[PDB]
């Protein structure tokens, strides 16, 4: 199995993660009974696949629409990632209280996931993978990478 | 009369004297303001404070800021007289304006106020406000 191989099958295997939605190995962090961060409760190995920053993928259009929607109630929060793929600018809009892990996870100027554009036939998603090797028990932090 | 009044709330937004409020502590961190004296309907609160600016150097002060989310949002956009303004308080300073929270239930309005043609973003008391109460803002 070559290098590329193992490539497209992790991209499969990652392909079905974000399509599953299952978001295993992780947990809510708590403090007086509110969701402050997220802690990995397995091994993660430099460049593995941690979770999506899950949202609806919108245009600018549609994306200043929601955002002058937001802004009137702080309620809300600022949960929209704007970013370009392919000459284009797209918004990742996790504004919707969910249960999903992916927009508990904090920043950190020294974390230890950064963010990556994953492909699935065309439309952008944005992951975070692991910045190098982390242990059970550690808080994800995530900067830009 | 008029001209006078005017002339007061100008004062206080260009003295940068804030007074009557005090920051609300917990773990050390400064959280929500406290009124530390009387407010009657309509009187001025505080400006939310910030570096006025159009659309061009909104939008890149935005990605930058983007990129540190220690930062946080701060920046308020707003129409005045058919064009689009932005005031940004991403700056951490002792300005307390930044400091007060959002309530559906709240005790302050946004309002414009203009001193000669710039306009200012200032709170205003939407009800009277006895001392010792948070406050807490919504749009007006
Ligand atoms: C994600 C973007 C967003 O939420 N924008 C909202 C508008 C800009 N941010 C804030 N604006 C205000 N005001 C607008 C005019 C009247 C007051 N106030 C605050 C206060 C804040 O902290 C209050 C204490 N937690 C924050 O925190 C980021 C932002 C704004
Ligand atoms: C103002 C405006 C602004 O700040 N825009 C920043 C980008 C959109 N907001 C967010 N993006 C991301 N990511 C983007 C891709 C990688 C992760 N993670 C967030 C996690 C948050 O809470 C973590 C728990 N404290 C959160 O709280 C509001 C907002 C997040």
Redesign the pocket.
Known sequence: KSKAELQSEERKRIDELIESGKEEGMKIDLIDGKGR?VIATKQFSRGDFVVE?HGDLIEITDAKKREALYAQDPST?????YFQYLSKTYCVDATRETNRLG????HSKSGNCQ?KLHDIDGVPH?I?IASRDIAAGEELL?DYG
């Open positions: 961060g920053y929060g600022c949960y929209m990632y927009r508990l996870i904090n963010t944005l975070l995530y």
